[model samples]
Target: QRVKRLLSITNDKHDEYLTEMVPLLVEFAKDECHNPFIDKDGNESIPSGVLIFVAKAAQFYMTNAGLTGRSMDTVSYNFATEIPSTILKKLNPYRKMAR
Candidate 1:
């Protein structure tokens, strides 16, 4: 749902590489359970790599969310502030822009 809407704005699907080449890499990985990166004398690490990967996806979501909402603050506050105040500072979050 969101991706479709985003593609409508970014027009990213117009690029055969993003819409095509990337999928070739993904589908190839699905059956082989492999990443070309893993075979290229590269190493994967936990925690940090997971954070980086998921963060990229989160940024994609934020872009879509911005198009459909008032602002990032409103969305973040509602989704995040469900947690008790006690844990927020302990968990530690960064805000790139306030309000």
Candidate 2:
């Protein structure tokens, strides 16, 4: 549903590639962010951070849809490095403490 809404914004069809990437992005989001903390009422709710992480992760894959790396030709695009940095900044604040 989330992916559909987002793709609709750009009028993009939910292609097979994007369908595959969604779960991959979710795993990436889950790995990087802390799980939802339990509430006092014993209810577990998704953290706002998860939403942010998912959004950014989706953008990350969408942004680099066809590029195998940072180069279109012989020259490397340094700006490509900024992609991961952009996503990491959001997840950093909610990073899980690995034990």
Candidate 3:
């Protein structure tokens, strides 16, 4: 719920989860069917690249829970546990991506 609202502009702060969605994605992306977890005072805004870190630090449980990369002895998950993660500690995440 919070995820969907945060993805958009306008939002209501008192909707209850009482609606079914047409498609699963649409259902997951619906209002009343969402969470009322917005910080009305806007004090919980996350940093730009921090979500990546937090995502990397966590585990992901999705539809395709499998592998992405496989090296000689190391491997990476396809749908990573974290949506945003920084595997390289020395990598300056704040630094903009290079083209």
Candidate 4:
């Protein structure tokens, strides 16, 4: 719900896609942040920052249509192989140190 709100998406058109994509994004975030979406009490909890990160990454995935850069008359675009650094930086605090 918060993801939909952040993306300003009010319709169910992408509901199916979101349902499939969100979990993958959550997994990606967990890997990147080294946080397992769990708390001290062993309860699952998603932090707001992580949610926002997923939202932004989803927006990127939804917008990009190609794998490589393309140019078409007055428009040029490129797709990122990974989540943007700016969005990934939001997970800094959640990142666990290496043993």
Candidate 5:
């Protein structure tokens, strides 16, 4: 899919991460899952901060999905590295430790 590929994911090998994870977060944040603003009393509410989470998720997903192939040279253009802890830390609250 274009969505999967644009995020730098080469395949559906990690569907849980590339499909379920990011898509659900986006739906909830956009109020498609359930609009936090729509309450019975007619008093609308603002949504909590989610863009930060979105950014973190996208980067984390891409980091995990990219560069499936490897090269001998460490400095090769295709060289890939581990996902940084800074990004991982933010997703901890979401219990992203594992499946």
Candidate 6:
């Protein structure tokens, strides 16, 4: 739902895809952020920062549609294959220290 808003989607056409993508993104975020969005009591409560990161990543993947790069004349842009550093920065506070 949040990802749909980020993508400005107003229909259910992609709901199935988004449903499948959500869990994958959440797991990816857990690995990347180094912290599962779960409390000490074993309850999951995702932080706003992490939610935003997943939404942004979803938007990126949807927009790119699996393309690595695109070119228009002399101008070209390289699409990232993973979450970019700027977005990852938001999850810093939640990151577990390396031992």
Q: Which model scores highest in TM-score?
A: 2
Model 1 bad stretches (over 4 Å): 8-37, 41-65, 72-99
Model 4 CA lDDT for position 3: 53
What is candidate 4's lDDT per residue for 51-93, written digit by digit as tens? Answer: 6655655555444332222223354322233344434544544
Specify the poorest-scoring 10-residue window by lDDT in model 4: 64-73
lDDT of 2: 0.49
- The TM-score, computed over Cα atoms with residue i paired to residue i, of candidate 3 is 0.21
The better-scoring model by TM-score among 2 and 5 is: 2
Q: Model 1 Cα displacement at 18 (Å)? A: 12
The digit string of per-residue lDDT tens for model 2 on 1-99 reads 366555653313554454344444444456455342436674544445545555565556455443332336556655565545654654465575221
Pairing residues by index, what is the TM-score of model 6?
A: 0.33
Better of 3 and 6 by TM-score: 6
RMSD of each: 11.4, 8.6, 14.5, 8.8, 9.5, 8.5
Q: How does each model score on lDDT?
A: 0.41, 0.49, 0.30, 0.48, 0.49, 0.48
Compose the digit string of candidate 6's lDDT tens values, residues 51-84.
Answer: 6655665555544442222223354433242244
Model 5 Cα lDDT, one tens digit per residue, 48-77 = 344455555555555554454333364644
Q: RMSD of model 4, in Å?
A: 8.8
TM-score of each candidate? 0.26, 0.37, 0.21, 0.32, 0.31, 0.33
lDDT of model 1 at residue 41?
54
Best-to-worst ranking by TM-score: 2, 6, 4, 5, 1, 3
- TM-score-wise, the better of 2 and 6 is 2
lDDT of 2 at 91: 49
Error of 6 at 93 (Å): 13
Clashes per candidate (backbone, < 3 Å): 0, 0, 8, 0, 0, 0
